[PDB]
Ligand binder design. Structure first.
Ligand SMILES: Nc1ncnc2c1ncn2[C@@H]1O[C@H](COP(=O)(O)OC2CC2)[C@@H](O)[C@H]1O
Ligand SMILES: Nc1ncnc2c1ncn2[C@@H]1O[C@H](COP(=O)(O)OC2CC2)[C@@H](O)[C@H]1O
Lengths: 656, 664, 651
């Protein structure tokens, strides 16, 4: 076979992990909605794609959501000009489907488990409390003149009120634009100005990992260049002395005390914009409609994680990420279950924090990024070994390919080999999970996204010819043939960039921008960004298979390989390797470590995949979501031309 | 028994007035919807409360109102945090339920009987005319940029166009804030600024009691401190020269002439705010939603007054009062009947005006306040005795406890002992009538509100312990157990004050602020405000029983007793008595009359209730709705005159100076 | 008989044209919705009028349109106070019924045949393309802050994007106010200021008949006196170097490139205003609601022209005219057929342009004005004789009474005596066609509108007594007894003028302002405006019969007769006659020609109708819609370059 699984230390015959007993309906656990085998997944999946799927999507839309006005058409439009339409005639409100309809049925059921930065301050927020807080904020926004269609910037840390600020905007038909708390004043400025918002919601200070986020300090600097912002709502999170501008700035609690605890729901057309979300050139504000996005997040959350009514979904991401949008707030609350708002880091107070949380609340699912798993892997298994963690049934990975080493560490310790691992592939532009194994039906492989989700008709294209590589054992670029409900509708006031980025390069398709491969079993392998691909002497090297090989060597915590122009091979491979903090870098020779890694790569991939130069760095350039910034490293090693900015100075200094 | 009826001259066994013949389906009168006995009221009432009442309330809302979008949930929310919800998902429009759907069935039926200040200028306003006037005003407001959710101030006298200005706001989804015509410039300013309205509706002048109300003069003075008001629509009521500011002020007739006579109805969510109404500390803007309030006003009117399609309802109150909101405009027009807009006073041209009106239009119900009833008692029965008044079937009282003396004068002369008397207890914050006898089912008692209305689950609480006084013959503070559709939703931009006033003092309940008593027959007695109670040597005195005792003495027209701290008795009783203007002044010594009143109180209540000092004054401090301002007298008779409020919009503000001068 | 047909050279017994074979269901043509005789038209019409007609109107509204929310009441209000209501409770969107529901059914079906000024640049615009363009413009408007109820001025030539600009406004609930491209800056200014619009849509330049319309040049002059206009969207139609005002003016293509190709449809109540249209004293902004107007245009287009799904409707009018509003955009697109946007004149490149167009696209109906018919009649029959034109089934005339001479030229050459001729009478204030023959059921007469459309119960009133002239063979002023769905709802911010013009003069009726006559056959004859009537010695002379008489004399191309105060006859007749440019007036003495025309009128009408003085002019004062401006001539004999010529001759 030509397409090979990501390098792993386990033999392939022992590397097929079928759904465990917890995902089989045993141990008193809920039977999965999809099961018990791969055919059972395809039987349902094939109903959701092709030109005969309209009846299926219409039925699901009416089952999943509560509509004020029914729709007549199911789908319309296409990629060509960016006129995607789903359920155009229907009306609904997101805050109603995420709050009201569950409050009316069981008001005391916990909507949010608020895990505070300090574990002792954690508490449960019922649907009643969240609904009342949401309605108060909505009335405050109306009193500020916020109208349906106006943009509202949210600059909030991971306190539970962030969901109230999200859903308050959705309740009145406003368009919220959430920005990671802790972004620089310049980054926040650009996103406030691009959405042309007149109202901004923030805190006095944020608390993550025992560190203070000077939110109001940053907002003041940014708004010195944001003339359109007239009202700033400041949530009193810490109570520390922070500057306040009289007239413009008002306290969250004081404003909400003047407002009623109920607010009517604005009846939104399906294609009314629900939110703007800028991704970390110019800031790209991905715009999502209402009904399609909500339906997508609801069904993926229900099917990709096998959600059941009493479950407690624990997504540890930040709401500044689409993962937080879709699988902390909208997805979980749409289905009417409990969701987790994690305010701290995975290592505060100690690297046992994740597992202290899981056993404290009896979390039934855990959702996080590969970068977090690698962080916990390099801290020691003592922090996980002595935990129960039996409430869990599904563990999810999102943001990047998951190295088989991290995959196993996730599977072995967090799941105790009794949880299904769902490597969920998707994008901010996809709205909901696009490719992931259904935990109760699909047998997994370390690092494989497996098979596409409902409504996702994906294929592999030759990047040069542009034609479909039919069959298995093929490698190329991933594309989608048909629109899906939760697909992004535009880029805010830059629809030209929306079409040129995803619709022009391969006409007739959606262009994810990812290299993909379909091995001989039909499993989809998403091996990294197309821009990250390295072509050594006519050999397409993907960063996932190379980095997966490097982590197989003892002591390695994280790696990142980029491409640079080479005299002989056209393009050569350069590697950045982060060793575990408890490595004896003095005992193992630096040059010897490079040779050991080089031979390691040669053994599992091929002679061509060996790095030509290796760089030792304390950490890698990373976004706030956890993605490795390979483009940044690539330009640095080329001479032409976000979590910890100090890594940039270290990388360029080590370049010489 | 411990709980005793309000002082009356009739024994209790001869003081129970069963439903009269007119309310029995006889004398060619419509058979009541509820009857014939008390059991028939309980059988239906029990469907409206308890955990099985959604089935009843859902049916009534859908049968009573026309909805643009149906609702899914019946009720939700509660008192605790002030998130009351009724029919959340439904959409509707008030102006549609009060105008359009009746215009479509019989456009020529009289919607408003306009009783002008001068009787000769009275005329009938059909539903067609009222709808066209409303749609024109709505289009004028739309042309001013008024959007759904915007506030509009109404400063209009009791001319028939006032209903058009109300329903025009409701038609476009705006929130009208009506202020009594004649309020001082300072009082109007504060209410115009508090609702943050940008448009003001007013007249050039108002006409009541043959005197000119310089409305536009007052509006001009107030608007120098109301910067948010950009457009003022002036109704030409008298036509006298009044200042007009070009651009800001434009004439009603001219503006409406540029607009079509139909306007689309904004589809309002059930919980969208319908109106703000400031009640006479800081101005308290009581906010009401749409569907709950509309349903409440409609059902109370249909059941408390036994409304039938052809009836002609005559509420003489002013639209600046919640009684006018609910039982002049919204209540009556929703039910599709005729309602009265009375522009004059009860004594202009003469104290026979009320009864001339009833016999001219053949009014079938009359609704007014005790202050007006006592006033007519004090003018002479020659002005009422020689009237027919046989069209009437139900007489209503609202605003304060009804004195057994006034109740009888109401029953004897206005009704000729052939009308059922409905003592309707409620508040601006309740939206619709809370406690009242159903005329065709309940036998009344002088001064008793009798039994609570549908959807009202009320109880008696000990004000200290906070526990329910179960059973009969109990006395305490009135509370409600469950929300009711028409309950106020908030105080405009002061939801904290809303919760602290009605929801915090007795958590889990609504606190009316009224002392109440449930006698041994189950009848409820609302004996006055809790703030007005006087505790003489640990004995709780309610202002109703004391003033009812005083009114039992011949010659008494009106009284008002307040409390003052006493060294020995803790609190002592002080009385303010307004005797008829033609009493034996100078002939009967002031000191001689004071002793007679004190002994009368000692004879019917007890020695502790005897006033220690009595003050004779020409009138009492009163609001424009007719409530006696006992807080003013209490603070004045306690040396707190410097700490009084904005007593400028009082019915007669000069009476305040008389009380403080009469300090000794 | 007292009521006589308009002067024609054909005998009356040879002047009744029954539905031709193409309109009878033969030759592979669709069965007409109404047929085959007059009784079939009356049988259906009686359901649409009277106090039991709600059942019919409810069914049509629900079958014809797609509603977001259903209605309960059918009709309400009346003429008295101007509170007409139709389907008050229902919601819908015009852009949805004209674009979305057809895009969802067949996106590639051609919505607009765009006939460019140069024939070689013509192309088909599919429903998909038109919908995408509309949604982009709608999103551009929303980004400008345009809200439901805001007015938007449209100053666009006859390029296909004009429909996109119309429907974009309708999509978001805005009220579009279209103004003829080429109107002076003063006329544009007055109409822009009266609607208080915040946004204006125009082109850099327009092209009609090979000439440049400096649209943006005119806009600049007008906006120097239009304070409320903040944003101007300029469509690059020609691309010529034109001034642009930074900030205020932005390009259509550039703005639309920033927007998605879909936009949600605003859910409009039936009586929400759809558009303002000023008619060419002070400018009169006629306002139309949504559901009534849309339903009216749909049914008249379906029945007056016997529209069928695959038909290709060719209305050559301009969208600045109500004919363009109702029977270029709304009518056809609502019914989901193909419509024509004709950008040129009927004589560019040659007077065969109309007929070259018909055979190129195989148009199934043609709709135009008498002013266009008369122009081509005087250009030579060689340009029409040698064309196929067999795709046509119905030819329509609109704007003014159709002279029997032009009527025959229409039927003889353009129709080849195989098309039904529909003389459609209505006004901007009626919304849709009021009186017209149903082509598959009614036998026509040259110059007669025949019978009123469904829902139109019209009558004749004696202009003096004010009483109804019941029966046939009656002549007077035309009025309507009951409101009809598409009736105009008001005049923008002048409901007083609206009531005084149409509702006050004859209370209880709608006053069209036209002299009318109902002959012994029940046929209705619209003989001209009441203001144009001439009372010679107590004889009511209508301009149609007098001008029809003048056109019966050979060499006459167009005429216009006005009234004059006379000492003896009370009112005297003055005639303005336009002879063909290739007439040798130098050979024929002026006085000789006048006597021949004067006697001609004496022969066909009577001695009293003879003009007292006849004036020879190259052309007549005309609007852009084609109506003859008789008021101009009337005051001229008392105390666009044609005005200078007319005043000099009478001296
Ligand atoms: N399961 C996965 N396997 C391999 N690669 C993955 C996977 N999930 C994400 N990615 C990478 O992250 C981008 C998305 O990031 P984004 O923040 O836009 O959306 C985030 C996902 C919510 C993908 O385009 C790709 O490059
Ligand atoms: N039948 C009654 N018996 C005894 N007291 C009554 C009665 N009606 C009103 N009140 C007093 O008036 C306040 C409300 O006045 P408001 O103007 O807000 O509402 C007015 C009533 C529409 C009550 O709280 C109470 O103190």
């Amino acid at each position: 076979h030509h397409v090979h699984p990501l390098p792993d230390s386990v033999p392939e015959s022992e590397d097929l992990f079928a759904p465990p007993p917890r995902m089989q309906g045993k141990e008193g656990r809920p039977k999965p909605h999809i099961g018990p085998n791969y055919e059972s997944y395809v039987k349902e999946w094939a109903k959701t794609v092709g030109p005969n799927s309209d009846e299926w999507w219409a039925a699901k839309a009416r089952e999943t959501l509560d509509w004020y006005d029914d729709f007549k058409t199911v789908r319309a439009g296409g990629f060509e000009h960016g006129d995607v339409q789903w359920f155009p005639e229907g009306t609904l409100n997101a805050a109603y489907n995420c709050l009201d309809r569950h409050y009316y049925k069981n008001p005391k059921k916990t909507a949010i488990i608020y895990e505070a930065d300090e574990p002792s301050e954690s508490r449960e927020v019922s649907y009643e409390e969240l609904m009342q807080e949401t309605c108060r904020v909505a009335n405050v926004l109306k009193s500020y003149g916020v109208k349906k269609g106006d943009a509202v910037s949210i600059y909030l840390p991971m306190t539970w009120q962030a969901a109230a600020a999200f859903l308050a905007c959705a309740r009145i038909g406003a368009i919220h634009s959430a920005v990671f708390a802790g972004f620089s004043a310049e980054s926040l400025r650009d996103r406030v100005n691009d959405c042309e918002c007149k109202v901004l919601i923030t805190t006095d200070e944020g608390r993550r990992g025992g560190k203070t986020i000077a939110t109001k300090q940053i907002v003041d600097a940014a708004l010195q260049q944001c003339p359109l912002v007239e009202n700033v709502l400041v949530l009193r999170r810490t109570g520390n002395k922070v500057p306040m501008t009289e007239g413009r700035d008002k306290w969250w609690d004081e404003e909400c005390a003047k407002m009623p605890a109920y607010c009517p729901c604005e009846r939104m057309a399906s294609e009314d914009p629900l939110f703007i979300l800028y991704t970390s050139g110019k800031p790209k504000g991905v715009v999502h409609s209402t009904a399609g996005y909500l339906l997508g997040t609801a069904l993926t959350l229900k099917y990709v994680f096998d959600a059941h009514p009493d479950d407690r979904f624990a997504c540890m991401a930040d709401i500044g990420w689409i993962t937080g949008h879709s699988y902390i707030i909208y997805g979980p609350l749409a289905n009417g279950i409990t969701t987790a708002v994690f305010e701290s880091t995975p290592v505060y107070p100690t690297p046992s924090r994740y597992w202290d949380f899981v056993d404290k609340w009896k979390a039934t699912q855990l959702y996080t990024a590969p970068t977090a798993i690698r962080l916990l892997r390099r801290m020691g298994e003592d922090h996980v070994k002595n935990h129960d963690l039996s409430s869990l049934r599904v563990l999810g990975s999102v943001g990047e390919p998951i190295n088989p080493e991290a995959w196993h560490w996730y599977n072995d310790f967090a799941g105790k080999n009794q949880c299904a691992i769902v490597d969920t592939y998707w994008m901010t532009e996809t709205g909901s999970i696009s490719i992931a194994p259904l935990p109760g039906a699909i047998s997994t492989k370390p690092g494989s996204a497996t098979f596409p989700f409902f409504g996702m008709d994906v294929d592999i294209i030759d990047p040069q010819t542009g034609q479909v590589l039919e069959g298995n054992d093929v490698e190329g670029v991933l594309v989608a043939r048909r629109p899906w409900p939760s697909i992004a509708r535009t880029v805010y006031r830059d629809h030209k960039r929306y079409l040129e980025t995803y619709m022009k390069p391969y006409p007739g398709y959606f262009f994810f921008g990812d290299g993909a491969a379909r091995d001989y079993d039909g499993y989809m392998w998403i091996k990294g960004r197309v821009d990250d691909v390295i072509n050594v002497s006519g050999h397409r090297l993907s960063t996932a298979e190379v980095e997966s090989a490097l982590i197989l060597h003892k002591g390695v915590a994280e790696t990142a390989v980029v491409g640079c122009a080479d005299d002989l091979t056209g393009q050569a491979v350069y590697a950045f390797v982060t060793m575990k903090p408890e490595f004896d870098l003095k005992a193992t020779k630096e040059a010897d470590l490079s040779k050991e890694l080089a031979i390691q790569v040669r053994k599992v991939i091929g002679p061509f995949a060996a790095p030509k130069k290796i760089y030792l760095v304390s950490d890698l350039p990373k976004t706030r979501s956890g993605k490795i910034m390979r483009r940044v490293l690539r330009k640095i090693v080329a001479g032409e031309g976000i979590a910890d900015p100090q890594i940039v100075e270290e990388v360029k200094q080590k370049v010489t």
